[PDB]
Task: inverse folding
């Protein structure tokens, strides 16, 4: 599951940057 | 969701802004 794991690490950083003060949720069951 | 949308092909910051609260 490591490719997805690494991708997610970068998605959260990018979400952090664009969302700013809005913040964001990162979750889900699938 | 976001992994299937953005781990299979590149999402720009404009696309990722969709997921902000
Ligand atoms: C910025 C970023 C990280 C990971 C996947 C993406 O599609 C985009
Ligand atoms: Cl990586
Ligand atoms: Zn990395």
Result:
């Amino acid at each position: 599951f490591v490719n997805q794991h690494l991708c997610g690490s970068h998605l959260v950083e990018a979400l952090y940057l664009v969302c700013g003060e809005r913040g964001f949720f990162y979750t889900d069951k699938t | 969701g976001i992994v299937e949308q953005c781990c299979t092909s590149i999402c720009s910051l404009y696309q990722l802004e969709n997921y902000c609260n």
Remarks:
- Residues A 6 surround chloride ion (ligand 2) (CB under 6 Å).
- Residues 2-6 of chain B form the longest helix (5 residues).
